[PDB]
Ligand binder design. Structure first.
Ligand SMILES: Cc1cc(N2CC[C@@](C#N)(C3(C)CC3)C2=O)cc(C(=O)NCc2cc(F)cc(-c3cnn(C)c3)c2)n1
Ligand SMILES: Cc1cc(N2CC[C@@](C#N)(C3(C)CC3)C2=O)cc(C(=O)NCc2cc(F)cc(-c3cnn(C)c3)c2)n1
Ligand SMILES: O=C(C[C@H]1NCCC[C@@H]1O)Cn1cnc2ccccc2c1=O
Ligand SMILES: O=C(C[C@H]1NCCC[C@@H]1O)Cn1cnc2ccccc2c1=O
Lengths: 484, 484
């Protein structure tokens, strides 16, 4: 009903509700994750889990509660448990917004010698961040599922290499699983995690509202938390030294980003590598046909495709028309549908329709498994490459501040030479907010532009390039935009 | 240090701490699950997940918070969130002790027609039950990991068949994965879940303290929650009818039961089917030997065993002796260790020692993979059969109440003919508590005996057998004991 290029927020709501991905809940900012979305979470979780276990990372489970003393060592976002029944607790306890203060006292106890390092742990769980602003399903919620990984190393260089390895895993999570392009970069001093040394990030872009969104994060913590929690190891000489730490996380926000990137006016489009149903088989069931024969062949084709590890469902319900089923599985984003009626059976072929473009194919039964494998890889790659083209066309390279507001009004990001002085970033935030409010009055949700990241992939910097806002000597190209 | 048959509680604490399964935490009743235990949780979770997905059950994720109104529709055990930072919430919200009141309003919305049934959902998450009593790691904790499954059906018979199917999956979880024997049964009217029609259970037994413990649970809810939450469906006639529901759950308590069942004085013994390391390879590293050759052969053997899906770790650390490593991996419960030094290499054999009995074998390299597969299945079966023998010898079949206290003093359960009158069960609880306190004073934690279950496997009931406590006509054999 709602078109993606008109009212994007109602289009998004419709897409995720009518596909049965989410259900609303009476506590604002929390949503139920129904199986159609949860299956995709399980897929990207299995991918990430397999990859970090190759790195020596092991899973664990730390408590969801943290004592006041351990935590206070943001604060309006922490939900506090204060009573058990109607009786009060001696000291209130907080629900984890993140688990640094829960895990790191244990780390301090576990780590004694250089032979105890590196220590690499992860956990899958939910965290709670209690903001009063308007939530967005998947993207910004008061409770969300995530993983958080936390490691400790004998040297800064080894920790930093792990930070980059994890960030490459997040790039693969988005680009290789979800077909969403991202930009690797480092956060500005004002945007980085306060408790760390350097925050690396992958950033995505939502063309319809022009907003950048942080996709995942990998922090070089250095020795800051090691001094805070007294996490030290002994070298083989016997001298005690602080450990060098990392932490990293990624959330169900990734599902929302995937949904927004690939959806169209008919609803969801799910990349084949994460679709729980890759091929839906729809028999044509005329009253005047050998229905048993048609259903039998559908079952044979399902078996044949599953031997190729294709995930198949047959929708053989007699009480819905094929047109109804076409729309039903399009709305849910199944990437391929296979139609089989008496004429196809007589020709020994099946008709296959791809969800992204609607192109149709007639495929022999012998060619079905390899041709469908090839088509799923083509769909996955085309979804990614068109998203990547939209990303590149959503970024304007600029040289002075005069170009900021026009580009923002085109719902674009800007890539600008920046001197990286923190004071300049907050001046830029405040000025672009003011200019946005003026433009809003002339037109008849926040408008501020901030840094999204300083990209790893730096374009050439001609000698003597000036900062686009301060006029001081520029240091690096920086990606800015309105943001989630 | 502590012997299992002397101070069982210190033996248990040592076993789980020195093996690095748990770490203590400053909030009483909560424990950290370290990787050595968490890997076992992941194994039984994968087993259960695979089995219920074959049944059509799909995973999901519902919020951890429930509003006061929805929940109140036990109470001292519910932890309440009342503030965000230092600011109060309009209405307090509770942390899930279980998710019936969170999921079932959604069910009422989702279910409209008989073609929407059955509805089968599960989730893996943690719940919180805030008791002030003394916790026991794994067995009784204020936060614990579990799965909870919740289904809805058009008829009571289909719901009841699902209840039994799930209970058979729990039997397999304990007996087939963990090698722990359990007794299927139905709970008494006084012990069953209040909101349901009938509670089925599998019960285990801890010989060292004589206590039964509920291992997992599967409830026939019938239509009670359907009326509470107005969950109704239409038949093809058009009449509205209440759904018939089930719920079922199982927790990390299962790990504790496994630990207590198979451990010995040296520490943990982990059944091969859930051990994250099934075989540890320990090279002998004399100073005066070709160490590179020995390590190379260890790597080749590891590859050969892993082709047979055996989970292998090589402990090639030069700075620990083989004796130290033997003890280290015994304490952690690895079921098989493989020793390889220059003499073994010259003979083309390896020495293999099984953890349960200490028996040693000399195995040719060609015979290693099939012989180790056979040995792991023998270890698994022997662990189960000896546990099952201890279970059978821990149960005394009795006919009158006079036999209760002697059997309880032998740290046994009793199987007795019972009339199943609820009033009699609470009289029995109170009387055995009083008798236990008297015995405690004569000797120089609760002592009450309650029903554990009415077993599915009923022994013969001679005509006119009387209830062992009331003297009324007996109805069924019932298993009683002290309990967790
Ligand atoms: C799912 C999710 C995901 C994320 N993030 C943050 C970065 C990250 C990445 N990459 C992580 C955590 C991995 C590092 C990610 O995924 C943040 C939030 C969130 O901040 N929730 C609270 C909330 C509730 C709410 F009702 C409204 C708002 C709200 C409305 N307007 N504004 C300005 C805030 C905020 N939630
Ligand atoms: C891990 C776990 C597991 C279980 N159960 C219950 C049945 C079940 C099974 N089968 C489930 C939930 C699956 C159906 C199971 O696993 C119960 C508890 C628990 O009741 N926790 C609260 C608590 C904390 C605490 F510090 C102390 C006590 C305490 C001390 N003495 N007494 C009498 C209580 C209780 N905990
Ligand atoms: O959570 C992090 C840092 C990293 N922790 C590990 C996983 C990746 C993650 O970005 C930062 N943060 C964010 N939000 C809060 C809200 C309230 C209290 C503390 C915090 C708080 O610390
Ligand atoms: O949790 C259950 C019933 C089933 N719920 C689904 C998974 C299996 C489980 O036994 C019973 N119970 C147990 N303990 C409480 C404590 C506080 C509030 C409610 C409860 C409460 O309801």
């Amino acid at each position: 009903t709602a078109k993606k290029d008109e009212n994007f927020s109602e289009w998004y709501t419709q897409a995720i509700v009518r596909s049965e991905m989410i259900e609303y809940y009476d506590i604002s900012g929390c949503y139920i994750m129904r199986p159609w979305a949860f299956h995709i979470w399980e897929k990207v979780q299995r991918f990430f889990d397999d990859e970090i276990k190759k790195m020596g990372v092991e899973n664990s489970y730390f408590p969801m509660f943290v004592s006041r003393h351990k935590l206070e060592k943001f604060s309006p976002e922490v939900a506090w448990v204060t009573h058990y029944g109607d009786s009060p607790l001696p000291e209130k306890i907080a629900i984890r917004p993140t688990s640094e203060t829960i895990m790191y006292p244990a780390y301090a106890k576990w780590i004694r010698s250089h032979r105890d390092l590196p220590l690499k742990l992860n956990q899958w769980c939910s965290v709670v961040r209690w903001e009063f602003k308007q939530p967005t399903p998947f993207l910004r919620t008061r409770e969300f599922l995530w993983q958080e990984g936390h490691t400790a190393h004998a040297t800064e260089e080894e920790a930093w290499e792990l930070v980059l390895d994890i960030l490459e895993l997040y790039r693969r999570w988005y680009e290789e699983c979800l077909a969403v392009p991202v930009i690797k970069g480092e956060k500005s001093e004002g945007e980085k995690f306060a408790g760390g040394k350097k925050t690396t990030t992958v950033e995505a872009f939502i063309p319809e509202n022009g907003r950048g969104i942080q996709a995942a994060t990998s922090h070089l913590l250095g020795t800051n938390f090691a001094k805070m929690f007294e996490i030290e190891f002994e070298d083989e000489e016997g001298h005690k030294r602080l450990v060098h730490q990392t932490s990293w996380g990624c959330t169900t926000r990734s599902l929302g980003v995937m949904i927004m990137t690939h959806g169209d006016d008919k609803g969801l489009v799910i990349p084949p590598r994460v679709a729980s149903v890759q091929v839906v088989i729809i028999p044509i069931l005329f009253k005047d046909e050998n229905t048993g024969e048609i259903l039998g062949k559908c079952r044979e084709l399902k078996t044949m495709l599953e031997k190729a590890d294709i995930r198949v469902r047959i929708d053989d319900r007699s009480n819905y028309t094929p047109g109804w089923k076409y729309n039903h599985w399009e709305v849910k984003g199944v990437p391929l549908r296979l139609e089989l009626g008496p004429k196809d059976l007589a020709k020994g072929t099946a008709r296959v329709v791809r969800r992204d473009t609607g192109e149709a194919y007639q495929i022999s039964w012998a060619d079905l498994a390899p041709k469908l494998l090839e088509l799923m890889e083509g769909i996955q790659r085309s979804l990614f490459e068109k998203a990547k083209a939209r990303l590149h066309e959503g970024i304007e390279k600029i040289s002075t501040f005069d170009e900021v507001m026009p580009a923002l009004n085109r719902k674009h990001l800007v890539l600008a030479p920046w001197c990286e002085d923190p004071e300049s970033e907050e001046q830029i935030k405040k000025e672009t907010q003011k200019l946005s409010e003026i433009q809003a009055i002339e037109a008849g949700m926040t408008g501020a532009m901030k840094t999204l990241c300083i990209p790893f992939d730096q374009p050439p910097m001609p000698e003597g390039t000036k900062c686009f806002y301060t006029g001081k000597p520029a240091k690096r190209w920086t990606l800015w935009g309105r943001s989630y």
